[PDB]
Amino acid sequence: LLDKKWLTFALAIYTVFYLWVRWYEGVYGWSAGLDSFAPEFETYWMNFLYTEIVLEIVTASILWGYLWKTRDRNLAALTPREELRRNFTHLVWLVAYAWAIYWGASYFTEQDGTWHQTIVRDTDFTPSHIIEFYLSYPIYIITGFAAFIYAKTRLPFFAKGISLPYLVLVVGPFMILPNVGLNEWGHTFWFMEELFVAPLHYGFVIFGWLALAVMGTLTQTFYSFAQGGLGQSLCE
């Protein structure tokens, strides 16, 4: 069996959900989405924030909780074949994390490289944010943690000591969300324009660099992959 069809679903959900997200914001940009003090904006964008903030917190607790609850207690007694399967499942988790990273740190963020370049900031909770900062960022942050927790609770060798690179690749990108306070404070205060290369932004840049720990994570995952079923084949 090994690598199953869980990866297909992983890529599907994000794509599907994010595809509808673009459709929503695409149909609710102008009109009851432009004016942030209108009554229709609280019904189409204010409600979205609330709803998405609750679901994210709920899902996170459940996902992380369930993953940590079913954690393997007897890792020592784990057959190589089984380990391989778990390694493939963790690779599927990493693929889902990579997909969510792209969507949240590339699309919706540059999808934003546009909204502002067209409309004046009405409030700290504009349509694009109700999509980028508070939906896609928590979604990938959730996936990131999930992947990390799974690797430390299932697969052997990735446990018994938090992996530095993995921790940096899961927390580094997770720090961008809170930095939203920075650029907001940037906008609201220092800087009255729309420059995208302003400092009150290097905050995402600094913690966007921490996503480069994916290289250490992937070599660590390779080593874990090449534990029992590393050969042969490889160097043979």
């Binding site: 940009g29 102008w30 432009l34 003090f37 009255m192």
Partner: protein, 382 residues
Amino acid sequence: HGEKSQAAFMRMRTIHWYDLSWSKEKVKINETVEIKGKFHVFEGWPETVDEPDVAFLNVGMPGPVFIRKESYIGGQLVPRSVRLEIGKTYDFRVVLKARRPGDWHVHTMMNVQGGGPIIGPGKWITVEGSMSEFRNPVTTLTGQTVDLENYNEGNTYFWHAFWFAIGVAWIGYWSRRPIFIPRLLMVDAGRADELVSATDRKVAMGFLAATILIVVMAMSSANSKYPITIPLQAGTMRGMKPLELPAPTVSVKVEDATYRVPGRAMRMKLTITNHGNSPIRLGEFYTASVRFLDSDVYKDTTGYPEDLLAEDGLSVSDNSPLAPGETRTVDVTASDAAWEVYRLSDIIYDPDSRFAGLLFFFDATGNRQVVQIDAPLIPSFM
């Protein structure tokens, strides 16, 4: 759309827009709509904003629904940022060509170098037709007429697709052999020098030479075709001709101004002295995009937006004609649902409770006088 969120006091004391006029309310695709008016830079410029040494006359709209055909400060075109003098009055004219069908809220805003966007009044303009009918023709000095909607698009796509293709080929070339785990083990367990051997090196040299040669040849070809090119035109434009308005013959002194919290009305006591030789009367009070009118004196006929226009929102305790030389003190109350709809009563949350506005005095003959008032605005609760 972007206003109502900015500080009420700063919206009141920055740029006063008046004499605004819109050529059309409903336009077809490719049709032109012209927006005219005057804006006055307030002398009491908020210290938090930089002076309009570098200002740009922009248009507030949701994306490129209207293309800015032309824009003028005074009588000269201003495609770049301009320098405005505090206390001066300028007349502007913006020409827009309809591009996207729908109902849009167009604002005549102004962008200051370091003070945010100063959005003016917005008017709903309806666009009918189809976006496919939009044309943006422009004749170059090289003697060729090209459309700005699809010019260089094909060329832009080709070059990007061409390079992306080259990059994919490069990665693809090395992507044919196993990539990560066997190569990592080979590099680890013992020396490498087996995953990268000729003709791999030959391929890399060919790739580098081909890339350099293609870049050089493409630059040479793009220098033969289009042999005449100019750099991007930029730079702040100075010498902005201001309006030569005649000194107002009416002097107004603001003696305290209060607004109820909560409430939709602003009250102030004014001592108006009428100089010259004509019976004048207060007919309008413009504070921040909101016009409070006295229907018994002045009526709006320029199609001002309904949400920003108060037909009878200005009430004067004694609005009888003021004889020349006579000075009197009256109580003026500006009340309209627009003082709460546009969050004009949210000046209490501001760190500077001061207001500024324009008073329009009209005489029997119909000619009007523009005077400016600014005073601290004191909230009242009990």
